[model samples]
Target: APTATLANGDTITGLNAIINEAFLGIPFAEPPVGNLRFKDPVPYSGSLDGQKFTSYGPSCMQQNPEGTYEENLPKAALDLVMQSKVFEAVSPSSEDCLTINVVRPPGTKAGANLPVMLWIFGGGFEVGGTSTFPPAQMITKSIAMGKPIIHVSVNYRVSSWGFLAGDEIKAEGSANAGLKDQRLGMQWVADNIAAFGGDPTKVTIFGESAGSMSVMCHILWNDGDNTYKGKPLFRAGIMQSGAMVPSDAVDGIYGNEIFDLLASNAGCGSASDKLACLRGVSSDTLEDATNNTPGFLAYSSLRLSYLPRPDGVNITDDMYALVREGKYANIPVIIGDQNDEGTFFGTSSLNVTTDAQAREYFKQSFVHASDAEIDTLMTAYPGDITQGSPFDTGILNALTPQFKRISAVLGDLGFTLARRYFLNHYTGGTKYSFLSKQLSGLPVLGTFHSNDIVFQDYLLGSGSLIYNNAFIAFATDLDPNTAGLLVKWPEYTSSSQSGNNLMMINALGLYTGKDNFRTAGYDALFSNPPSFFV
Candidate 1:
């Protein structure tokens, strides 16, 4: 293991052994706690103090046991094939968890520059950590796939530690602390990735769900300055299912909702001393309040309200506004949504049959919608008596079925339409837009909310149709292995010749000229949006 002085002066050490070809796990910022809870991340200064980075650092503070995000993962896929032993997950957790791990090829000399891929894990912004998604193997695979790039994953605060907001708390300029931690991590990567055989200048930040949203936020705030002190940083970004817009931004009412819950549960009145009261509250109490949020977009769970605020510090303006006005950072972007993305919202678990249940479900779930709004939504999704009731239709229902209509209403507003907005806005820049239509052959696992995580896992797996070593070829060479299975990819703009021009990834590697990614009904709805959508 080896250690180096960081720009922030905090000593961070993890396994520094030669795994394939790079170093991993260096600290970039101090822990965000006490007075630092909701403030922007403070830079760290690593030591020339002979630090030993021969082991994995503790995982960030989260809901799971001490430091065990690994245990929280869906079982089936363990044992990262090409993983380095030193940075694997371990016990012992803490609040001071602003650390990043890296993976690189062997034998690269000092000051060797390479494009960087900064990975942000996705668990709805409530539950996830660097260790949860093993990137060591993915990095190795990407390298073999001609995109041999340096990979880095940072562990940031999650749940209450990351996203604690409310009326009482917002007055202190402490919203979106989690996002601040991510910005600081990028700063650290820019300043220090060189030692790990990574090029700081060419960086691609990417993530799914909340992580993806954070990437878009970072792009909006790209002012070409050092994130912390004067460290080097990122160039382009990738997002999957997340983009921050003004409507999604947390409002004072949402803040009040959380404040009321926390206050009532804490037996305190409006946090008489907001800072002191919260600071003194137990982490468990904090976790409960974070987890107990109700309705759509709650704090940590799906019920939590989450979106980076346009506070002018990290995010100067609402991203959608900037994108619509053609004022966003002009960078090459890749964005897409998973097919059947709504299944993650209890759609698969519940039985949707009757129109009554469907309408009632919509009314109860979307609390703020007016009666007229609900009526309009119902008109868009007229019931299907053939399926008994609209709400009881199963996955077998057609895309135009009333159930699918409901899904489109929720999905488009929440993710799909935003994707179109992003694609239209970013077309001036070299951009690639795709809809993940290729469903897994597995009957139960056809392109759902979290399915990409696993499919990506499969794509990056050593034994799957696309193996690890092959992927590494692409990362190192910037081109995938061109076998018969691989298909040419395309970019979307207002002048694209045909709908099928975009590439599709399926059980088969890649197929060009296939536009029926989503069902016909859903496609029509998106193609000709109603007057309200326009």
Candidate 2:
């Protein structure tokens, strides 16, 4: 067994029988229970002189109380969603779930100061846990590349447990609790990672899907440029299949509506003090109400119930709007997306088969959007099936005539649009971009969202070598085009010798491509973003 002594005098037990040392379940915050239920996580500052951290921490409550969320999804939707492994159908959960896992080269002593990467798992910010996505293989691969590094995966509350918004929610300094949990988790790593022989100064935060969004938020979070106590928490970031989308306010329309729903579900609606009554209830009570609420498995898949909104403080002004200004962190970043980024999310909308149904779905999702606004979207992403997702495979993988159309629209709306916008509008140097069409031949889902780093492939696959090595190369040297990479990755630019220098990644080969796809569509998408797309 491997053990590391923290500066705080804690002795952590880990797995040491191999090339890497595995330290798991080290709490970064106090148990978010009892009176602490709806508040931001407080750092676990006490001693743990003799603690064993050999297993992943218990998952945060997934809000799928009693497994009812997936059970209610349509079979086709369930099948497709399950295949993505986005949300676990079942897992052990607890309120005390703020923890981090560290995997490093064995016998590495303090002052070795190796680079570190934090792996933030994604489940739509509604469901996900670090336990299911291990980082051991990534660590091993980094060592094989001769640039050994440490990887840390952290667990934070999801659903209502950590993201209860609205007036009462924010009045007490508790808006965007989940984001706060992540902030505290990163702070803990920056403070204690050195004990595991990692350089706190060389930390890189990376994630896919909602995890990617979380990483993006970290660069924009905190009071100024993502700093904690006057020191930058992380120096670089990798956002895969996600970026900073617009966020509603804590007391915005969705927050108030969801707050009302939660209050009613937990018998707190009629109570004089809703937040207080909520805090008085059991953790299961809130988790159940949140799970039972409409989410990805519900009518509109991507319109999530819980989200990070402009709290008027940390997450200032619509988070999506933050990118327009010059206040946020501009550290070296690698942002990219899968070719068919929405097929997995499209699974929940397979019921809409006709043009009229598709129109209604769009209208419903883009609530404030007028017919003309959505009409442009419809035109840009037409129902020609041939024009739909899993692009290039003409007339194939169309579950419904509208399936491919919806998938195509969503792919651009959610993933592609944000990436292109961030890259185009962004004024930062050392920004690398990519497009993964590796598994594009898959039936209905195509390459889909996050296929590049799907945990299974990340655990063991040639794809992992490409992504993990590129990630390690970036983390180690602030550049991805190192000897570890199979191809030369370039910095992003709008008018380059090769059109934006977008790296086209395929299992077969890698090369550069243009970022100019459906320019008019993306131009309109940025202006007509759905209320919930944030």
Off by over 4 Å in 2: 65-90, 455-462, 484-486, 495-500, 528-534
Error of 2 at 188 (Å): 0.9
Query: TM-scores, in order shown?
Result: 0.78, 0.93
In angstroms, give how far residue 84 of model 1 lies from its true place.
27
Cα lDDT listed for each candidate: 0.54, 0.77
How far residue 87's Cα lies from its native spot in candidate 1, in Å, is 18
TM-score of predicted structure 1: 0.78
Best by lDDT: 2
Backbone clashes per model, in order?
57, 0
Query: Cα RMSD (Å) between model 2 and the true structure?
Result: 3.4
How far out, in Å, is residue 302 in model 1?
4.6
